[PDB]
Amino acid sequence: SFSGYLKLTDNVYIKNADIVEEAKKVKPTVVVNAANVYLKHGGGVAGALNKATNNAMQVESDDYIATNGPLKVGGSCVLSGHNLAKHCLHVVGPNVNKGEDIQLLKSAYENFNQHEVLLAPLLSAGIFGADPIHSLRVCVDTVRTNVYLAVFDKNLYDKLVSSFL
Ligand SMILES: CC(C)NC(=O)N(C)[C@H]1CCS(=O)(=O)C1
């Protein structure tokens, strides 16, 4: 199962790891993607997960959007996990750089509650522009299922652990 994680709460765990390498190693039931409403996996976690699938995630995602239209900010969809996981839960956190409501971050984390265990990044962190400390706080106060957070940046990981209330 998951190894090397620091336990933050009863159900939240955290590790300084590349989520792509972590997914290839564990092959979890669910890997969370930091998706946008269009499922255009260009950069950040989405670009990295998509590149690891040899673009199969993007091909599947374009068919999903052609059939269903865009997701809502705060929403999600379950697609294949390809070579990384059984499923990928594409979750749209608000992008502060796009002027999206940070209050939608709790709605985005609520999607995790539909899955017993997930490998995930911090929603709205990185290129989405939100404060990762705030994202971790919303995660622990919203997610009740078992979440294993992978934080790519060592310096941010140390700051998140050392400042965790
Ligand atoms: C069976 C899965 C989808 N749901 C799940 O594990 N739940 C969300 C439980 C975790 C604690 S609770 O929120 O009280 C009920």
From Swiss-Prot:
Domain Macro: 1-165
Known outcome of mutating S162L: In strain: Gamma/P.1
Regulation: Inhibited in vitro by GRL-0617.
Cell compartment(s), UniProt: Host endoplasmic reticulum membrane
Catalytic activity: Thiol-dependent hydrolysis of ester, thioester, amide, peptide and isopeptide bonds formed by the C-terminal Gly of ubiquitin (a 76-residue protein attached to proteins as an intracellular targeting signal)
Topology versus the membrane: Multi-pass membrane protein
Subunit architecture: May form homohexamers. Interacts with N protein.
Role of this protein: Responsible for the cleavages located at the N-terminus of the replicase polyprotein. Participates together with nsp4 in the assembly of virally-induced cytoplasmic double-membrane vesicles necessary for viral replication. Antagonizes innate immune induction of type I interferon by blocking the phosphorylation, dimerization and subsequent nuclear translocation of host IRF3. Also prevents host NF-kappa-B signaling. In addition, PL-PRO possesses a deubiquitinating/deISGylating activity and processes both 'Lys-48'- and 'Lys-63'-linked polyubiquitin chains from cellular substrates.
Protein name: Papain-like protease nsp3
Gene this protein is translated from: rep
Included range, full protein: 1027 to 1191 of 7096
